[PDB]
């Protein structure tokens, strides 16, 4: 699914950014642009980041 429609970021692209070395939502945001426009996706994006970092353990 698209998590962020403004910047065209999917849930898989959020996982990819983490696998590629992002350590936090703020880092994912710098990498992908997620949540930088209307901001409505931010909580969902954060949830994906949280789940991904947790699974990497």
């Amino acid at each position: 699914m698209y998590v962020c429609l403004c910047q065209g970021v999917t849930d898989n692209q959020i996982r990819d950014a983490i696998y590629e070395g992002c350590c936090s939502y703020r880092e994912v945001r710098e990498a992908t642009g997620v949540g930088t426009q209307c901001g409505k996706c931010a909580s969902l994006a954060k949830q994906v980041v949280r789940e991904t970092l947790n699974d990497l353990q």
């Binding site: 699914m1 698209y2 429609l5 999917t10 409505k40 996706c41 969902l44």
Partner: protein
């Protein structure tokens, strides 16, 4: 102000759901057309239009009751990346929509707004028909296989 304040809040909540569905279905429609799945594109366009008509009736009812229709707040769209995900996204949206409609109807009955109840029940019937269509499509993908299912939706009726 003749309208019950909580009725108006419920109607605005349903309106907000319709407004999300308008945009989600319209974008899904145009994505399907872009991919050459014109039968899905056409069907989804008509779903969008039907949500537009529900929104209109809601806005009209809110004005009659002397409330303020809220067209400013647009919640999150669920946009899929492929046909199966898009259908499921529409279905997820519709299950939330019908739960809210049932809760709105309960409150209408409680405060004796029988005309608002009747409007919501009509919308509910339409959204249930959409749920039927979605579950059917997802079932057909399983029965005929995804490639056949998509093939059958390349050309319009």
């Amino acid at each position: 102000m003749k309208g019950d304040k909580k009725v108006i809040q419920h109607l605005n909540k349903i309106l907000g759901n319709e407004l999300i569905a308008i945009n989600q279905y319209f974008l899904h429609s145009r994505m399907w057309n872009d991919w050459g799945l014109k039968r899905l594109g056409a069907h989804e366009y008509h779903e969008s239009i039907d949500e537009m008509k529900h929104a209109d009736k809601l806005i009209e009812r809110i004005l009659f009751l002397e409330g303020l229709p809220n067209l400013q707040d647009l919640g999150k769209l669920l946009i899929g990346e492929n046909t199966q995900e898009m259908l499921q996204c529409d279905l997820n949206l519709e299950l939330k929509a019908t739960k809210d409609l049932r809760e709105a109807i309960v409150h209408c009955e409680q405060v004796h707004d029988y005309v608002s109840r009747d409007l919501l029940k009509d919308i509910l019937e339409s959204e249930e028909e959409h749920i039927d269509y979605l579950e059917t499509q997802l079932g057909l993908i399983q029965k005929v296989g995804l490639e056949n299912y998509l093939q059958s939706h390349m050309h319009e009726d």
